[PDB]
């Protein structure tokens, strides 16, 4: 994936369902097939928080945190 475009995205303003949370990445993240957003705190969650919306800053193609796996 083009991490440049995945980041050129609107930056968070969006959402995703079936969201997950990596203890490695250390944060909330939504696998947008090819893209990976990241939720912080204020994130509307429903269904045990499996689906949510709010700000999902873009950072990985589909799993890496914001530090870029450093």
From Swiss-Prot:
Q: Which domain of life is it from?
A: Viruses
Q: Which cysteines are joined by disulfide bonds?
A: 6-35, 45-52
* Protein localization: Virion; Host membrane
Location of the region described as N1 in the Swiss-Prot/TrEMBL record = 1-66
Entry function: Plays essential roles both in the penetration of the viral genome into the bacterial host via pilus retraction and in the extrusion process. During the initial step of infection, G3P mediates adsorption of the phage to its primary receptor, the tip of host F-pilus. Attachment of the phage causes pilus retraction bringing the viral particle into close proximity of the host cell inner membrane.
What family is reported? Belongs to the inovirus G3P protein family.
Q: Partners and quaternary state?
A: Interacts with G6P; this interaction is required for proper integration of G3P and G6P into the virion. Interacts with G8P. Interacts with the tip of the host pilus. Interacts (via N-terminus) with host TolA. Interacts (via transmembrane domain) with host TolQ (via 2nd and 3rd transmembrane domains); this interaction allows the phage translocation across the host inner membrane. Interacts (via transmembrane domain) with host TolR (via transmembrane domain); this interaction allows the phage translocation across the host inner membrane.
Domain remarks in the entry?
Consists of 3 domains (N1/D1, N2/D2, and CT) separated by glycine-rich repeats and a C-terminal transmembrane segment. The N2 domain interacts with the F pilus, whereas the N1 domain forms a complex with the C-terminal domain of TolA at later stages of the infection process. The C-terminal domain is required for release of viral particles from the host bacterial membrane and proper integration of G3P and G6P proteins in the virion.
Protein name (database record): Attachment protein G3P
What is the scientific name of the source organism?
A: Enterobacteria phage fd
Q: Which residues of the full protein are shown?
A: 20 to 85 of 424
């Amino acid at each position: 994936e083009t991490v440049e475009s995945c980041l050129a995205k609107p930056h968070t303003e969006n959402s995703f369902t079936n969201v997950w949370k990596d203890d490695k990445t250390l944060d909330r993240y939504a696998n947008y097939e090819g893209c990976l957003w990241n939720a912080t705190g204020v994130v509307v969650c429903t269904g045990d928080e499996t689906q949510c919306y709010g700000t999902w800053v873009p950072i990985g193609l589909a799993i890496p945190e914001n530090a870029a796996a450093h």
